[PDB]
Amino acid sequence: ALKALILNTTLRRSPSRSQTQGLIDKAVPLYEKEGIETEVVRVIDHDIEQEYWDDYDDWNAGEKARREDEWPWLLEKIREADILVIATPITLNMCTSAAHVILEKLNLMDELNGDTKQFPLYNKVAGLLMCGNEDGAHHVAGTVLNNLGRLGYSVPPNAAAYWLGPAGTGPGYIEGKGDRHFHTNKLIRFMVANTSHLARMLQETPYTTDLEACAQAAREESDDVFAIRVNVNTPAIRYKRFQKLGEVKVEE
Amino acid sequence: ALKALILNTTLRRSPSRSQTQGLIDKAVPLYEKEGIETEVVRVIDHDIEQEYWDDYDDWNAGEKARREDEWPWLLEKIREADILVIATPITLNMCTSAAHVILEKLNLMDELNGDTKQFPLYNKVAGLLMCGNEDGAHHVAGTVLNNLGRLGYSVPPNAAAYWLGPAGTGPGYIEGKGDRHFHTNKLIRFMVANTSHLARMLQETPYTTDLEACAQAAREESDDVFAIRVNVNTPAIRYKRFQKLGEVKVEE
Amino acid sequence: ALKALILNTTLRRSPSRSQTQGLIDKAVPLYEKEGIETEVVRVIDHDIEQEYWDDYDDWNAGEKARREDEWPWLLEKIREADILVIATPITLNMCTSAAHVILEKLNLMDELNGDTKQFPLYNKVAGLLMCGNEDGAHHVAGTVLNNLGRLGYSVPPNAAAYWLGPAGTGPGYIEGKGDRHFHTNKLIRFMVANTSHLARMLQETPYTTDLEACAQAAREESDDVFAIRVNVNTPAIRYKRFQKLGEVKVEE
Amino acid sequence: ALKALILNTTLRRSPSRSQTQGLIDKAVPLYEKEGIETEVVRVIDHDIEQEYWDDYDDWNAGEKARREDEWPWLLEKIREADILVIATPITLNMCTSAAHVILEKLNLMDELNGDTKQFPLYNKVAGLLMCGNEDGAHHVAGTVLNNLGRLGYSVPPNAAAYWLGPAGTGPGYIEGKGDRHFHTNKLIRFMVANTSHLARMLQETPYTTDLEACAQAAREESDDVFAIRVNVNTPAIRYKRFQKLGEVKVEE
Ligand SMILES: Cc1cc2nc3c(=O)[nH]c(=O)[nH]c3[n+](C[C@@H](O)[C@@H](O)[C@@H](O)COP(=O)(O)O)c2cc1C=O
Ligand SMILES: Cc1cc2nc3c(=O)[nH]c(=O)[nH]c3[n+](C[C@@H](O)[C@@H](O)[C@@H](O)COP(=O)(O)O)c2cc1C=O
Ligand SMILES: Cc1cc2nc3c(=O)[nH]c(=O)[nH]c3[n+](C[C@@H](O)[C@@H](O)[C@@H](O)COP(=O)(O)O)c2cc1C=O
C-alpha cells in the first residue's frame, strides 16, 4: 500500500482559498483510483522554524532555531510517503518561500540507510503541481526536481503539471477557470499515472546501489586535496580552460 | 541488452582535447561493467542543420533547413538507446549551443507510439555529465533534465555528475586534475549505477500509461477556449490572482 | 549623500559566524571610500512575518499575517537606500528562504509615485553578494536581479560578486580562505565602483519615464480580453505556434 | 546620435513569418521617436560559424571554426550599437540556439579598452524582447541579462518585454493576437523609454571604473593559489560549510 503526500506551499493559511489547491483537488481522486492513499498538508498552517543552528554556530543565537516545532511531524510524513508531490504557487520565478524552507530543512538530513547505504529518501518518487499567474513553471520544475533528485527521489516523465495564464498580472486559476483548462487537466493525469507506476516499480525493485561502495572506489582513484594556481595579474573574467600556470605541489 | 548513448556537446571538433570528455572517459567503462553497450558521439563532428522549416514557413527560405544532413542518423541512435547521457560543457550558465540544437531538433518529434499511446522516448532513462570552469551545473541539470522529462525520459536520483572549479575563470578539468577529483568521481559512479538500474527496470516493467486515454478524460472535463478579461487601466505589473473583472462569454 | 543598504540573508542569527558576511566585510569599506553611507542588516535577526493576507483571503486565517512585525522598519530602509545589495548565501541553487521572504514582501508594494508615475523603487541601483560552497551564483544572480529590475532597480555591469568552491560539499568562504580569493575580491571591487557610479548618475539624472502615459498608449492599441481556442483532441505537448483553430469572438 | 541594434534570433530564415518579429515591429518606431537610429538583424539569415578553435585546440580540427564568415560584420554592429536588444523566441526554457551561438562568440572578446581599462562593451545598455507559447520569459531574462551584464551592459528597470500564452502548446503571438495584447504592449513601451534614457545617460556620463586598478588592488589582498582539503571518506553530498580538515600548505 503506497502513500502519496501532497504539500500545498501557499503563503495563505487555511481556509483562505488557494489557487494551487485547485490542481491538488484534481490529483487527489486520481491517486485514490490508482489505489494510492493520499494526504494533503498545507505547510504554512504548521509551525516550522526557519532559522538554522548547528554546533559551529553560536549557542545562544541558535536557541530559536532549536525550539520545539512541527518539523519532526512533517519530516516523518515525508519519510513514510512513497510519492512526494510539491504543490507550489510560483513566486519570483521560484517556488514559494514556504516550499523553500521545507526543502532547506529536508536537505539537512545527513544520514545513510542501514543496510542499503543509500540516502534516506532513496526509492521514492517526486511529482510537482505548480500554479502561476503567467510564467515560471518549467523553471521551478527544473530547480525543485533537480534538488529532490539529489535527495534520492526518482522522477518519471511528464511529472510536472501546472497552470499559467498569459503574459500579465493575473488573474489566477480560479477566476481564469483553470479547473476546466484542458492542458493542465491532461498534465495532471499524466503526472498521477506516471508517478503511481514508478512508485509501484521502485517498491518492488528498489535501487541496489551501494553509495558507500561507490565512494570507496572514488576515493581510491582520487586525491584528498584540490589545488589550482590563479592568474592574479588580470581583470579579465573571460573563461580560459587552459591557463598553463603549472601544477600546485602540496605538502606531505 | 541495453544501450547507453553519450553525447559530448563540446564546441570543438575531434581530436581537439575536450575537458568534458574526461568525465565521459570515467563513465564509459563503468557502464560496460554494468553490462551496458555504450557509444560516444561528439555531435559537433557531425553536420546537423540548425535552421527550422515547416509548412507554415516560406518554402524557399526553408530550403537550407530541409537539406540532407546527419540528423536522421543521430536521431535513430537516440531512439534506440535506452540511456541517453548528455555530456555538455557549460556555456553562459547553459548547456552548449550544440546541445541546444540537438534538443531543439529532438523536441520536433510529433509522434505517438502505436500501440502504447506514449511519446516515442517513453521508458528511456537520462543522466547528465557536465563540465564548467566554476559555476552552473545544477542550473543546467534542472533545465536539461526537465526538458528530457517532458520527452519521456525518467530520471533516477543523483543522475547529474559534474566537475567545476572555484569562482574564477578556470582552468578546466584537465589542468585542474578533475580526473582525480573525489566528488566528481563519486557522482559519476552514482549516476552510472542508478541510470543502469532504472533502465533495466523500465525495460522489464515499462509505463503502461495511455496518454490518449488521459487526454480524452481531460477533454471531457475541460473547455476548448481559454478567455480572461484584462485590466487595461493600470501600469502596474504586480501580480493579482483575483481581479473581479467578470467572466468572458464566448460565441457559440 | 547616497545610502547603500546591504541585506545579509543568512539563516543563522547573530553573532553566529556567517560565510556571506565575509564578502560584506570587503564591500562596506569600499563603499565608504566612495563617500557612500552604508548599513548592514541581517534580516533573520528581525521578526518578519511570512504568511500572506489580503481582502480576498479569510479574515481570521489572516490574523497572523496582519500582525505587528519589523517589516515596516525594514521596508523604510529599503525605500530610502539608493543602492540595495542583497548579500545571500546559496540554498537549493536559489537565494536563501530569508531573502525569498523579503523579496516576496517587497513585491507587494502596489503604489505609483506621485508625481513621476513610476514604481516606488525607480532610480535605485542593485548589486549582489553571493556565497556558496560550490555552485549557483550566476543562476541566483539572474533570478534575483531580474526580479529587482521589475521593481525599478537598475543594474550596472559586473554587479554580482560571489565566492564558490569547486564541485563538492564545502567548506565555505571562511575555511576556504575566501577573503584572500583573488577573483571574488576583484568582483567585489567591480561591483562597488559600478553601483556607486550608477547611483550617483541616477540621483542626478533620474528616469523621466511616465509609466501611466506608457500604459495609456498601450491601452489605445490593445484589447481588454485575451482569448484563444484550444485543441482538446490530442495528448501532444509539442509546441505549435500556428494551429489554425480560428479566432474567438467574444460578447459585447 | 545613438544606435539600437535589435537581433531577432528566430530559427527560421527570412521571409518566413516570425512570431518574435511582431514585438520588434512595435519597438522599432518607438525607438525612432526617441530619436534613436535602429537596425534589425535576423541573425539566422547570416553565416555565423558555431565551432570553436583556439591555439590549445588541434590545428586541422579547427579549420572550419577559423573559416571566413559573417561574424566580424555582426560583431562590429554590436560594438557600435549603444543599445543591444536581443529579441529571442523561447526554446527549451532558454533563448534560441541562434541567440546562444551569438552570445558564445560575443563572450570570446578578451580585450580591454585603451584608455578606460574597461571591457569593450562597457557603457552600453541591454533590453530584451521575448516570445514564447506559454512559459519561460523571466527565466530567459535572468540568464541572458546576467550574461550581458558580465560583458559590460547596464540594464534599466523593466527592460525585458515579452509575450506568452497560457499553459499549453500554443498558438503563438500572431494567432494569439499578441499585437493587441495590453501587457506586452505596455512592457515594450517601458523597455524602450528606459533603455533610451539609460543609453543617453551613459553616453554623457560613462563609468569611470578602472578595472585594472580594481584588479591590482585585489591582487595585493589575495593569494595566487586556491587550495582546500577534501573529505574523501564519505558518500554524503550534503553541504558542510565547516569541515575542520585543516589548511593546505603549498610549496614555495
Ligand atoms: C510575491 C509574489 C510573486 C509572484 N511571482 C509570480 C511569478 O514570478 N510568476 C507567476 O506566473 N506568478 C507569480 N505570482 C502570482 C501567483 O503565483 C500566485 O499569486 C498564485 O499562484 C497564488 O496561488 P495560491 O493561492 O497561493 O495557492 C506571484 C505572486 C506574489 C504574491 O502573491
Ligand atoms: C562562451 C563560453 C561561456 C562559458 N560559460 C561558462 C559558465 O557560465 N560557467 C562555467 O563554469 N564555465 C563556463 N565556460 C567554461 C567551460 O564550460 C568550458 O570552456 C569547458 O567546460 C570546455 O569543456 P570542453 O573542452 O569543450 O569539453 C564558458 C566557456 C565559454 C567559451 O568557451
Ligand atoms: C539547505 C542548504 C542548501 C544549500 N545549497 C547550496 C547550493 O545549491 N549551492 C552551493 O554552492 N551551496 C549550497 N549550500 C551551502 C552554502 O550556500 C551555505 O552553507 C553557505 O554559503 C552559508 O553561508 P552563511 O554562513 O549562512 O552566510 C547549501 C546549504 C544548505 C544548508 O545550510
Ligand SMILES: Cc1cc2nc3c(=O)[nH]c(=O)[nH]c3[n+](C[C@@H](O)[C@@H](O)[C@@H](O)COP(=O)(O)O)c2cc1C=O
Ligand atoms: C524546439 C522548441 C522548443 C520550444 N520551447 C518553448 C518553451 O520552453 N516555452 C515556450 O513558451 N515556448 C516554447 N516554444 C514555442 C515558441 O517559443 C516558438 O515556437 C515561437 O516563439 C517562435 O517564435 P518565432 O517565429 O521563431 O520568432 C518552443 C518551440 C520549439 C520549436 O519550435
